[PDB]
């Protein structure tokens, strides 16, 4: 019907910022029903509000290696999908 | 054959470099039985030979928005599994 639950895997950034991602992801899913837009949406918001550059990813399942900045990284599993975010300009 | 067929979708880098990724992904997959290790392996190899910084992802299904450099970007589905590679230091 609408299964969904947060499950932070790891995060290194201000609570409000990481929490923002949680809502940014939740709302992102509500608007977009495909990881492509979900990630791209979240990225723009963080890149525009928190200043560039943010890299975003979303998927039901996937592994990846990535390098980011500092105090600007977060990753959490929501429902049947994962939402990754971190600056790596 | 045993499936594991490459399927280039996006590419923006030296032929040998992109082809290297194809083999790097193919070999990476046969080495590790988890897309997570795949990216980490492929990434280190490119950051080692090509020099940092490379972002690599591998998953059964997902989507992500990311900005890279130039002449250092590539993406392709291998054996159904997605395998992304691109510099975005």
């Amino acid at each position: 019907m609408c299964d969904r639950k947060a499950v932070i895997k790891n995060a290194d950034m201000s609570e409000e910022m990481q929490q923002d991602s949680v809502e940014c992801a939740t709302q992102a899913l509500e608007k977009y029903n495909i990881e492509k837009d979900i990630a791209a949406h979240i990225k723009k918001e963080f890149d525009k509000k928190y200043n560039p550059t943010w890299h975003c990813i979303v998927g039901r399942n996937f592994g990846s290696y990535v390098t980011h900045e500092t105090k600007h990284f977060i990753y959490f599993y929501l429902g049947q999908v994962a939402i990754l975010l971190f600056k790596s300009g | 054959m045993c499936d594991r067929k490459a399927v280039i979708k996006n590419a923006d880098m030296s032929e040998e470099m992109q082809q290297d990724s194809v083999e790097c992904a193919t070999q990476a997959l046969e080495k590790y039985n988890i897309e997570k290790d795949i990216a980490a392996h492929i990434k280190k190899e490119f950051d080692k030979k090509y020099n940092p910084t490379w972002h690599c992802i591998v998953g059964r299904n997902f989507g992500s928005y990311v900005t890279h450099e130039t002449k250092h970007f590539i993406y392709f589905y291998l054996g159904q599994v997605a395998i992304l590679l691109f510099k975005s230091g």
Partner: peptide, 9 residues
């Protein structure tokens, strides 16, 4: 503002 880190669902 620079550090590598793995990630997986």
């Amino acid at each position: 503002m620079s550090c590598d880190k793995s990630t997986q669902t």
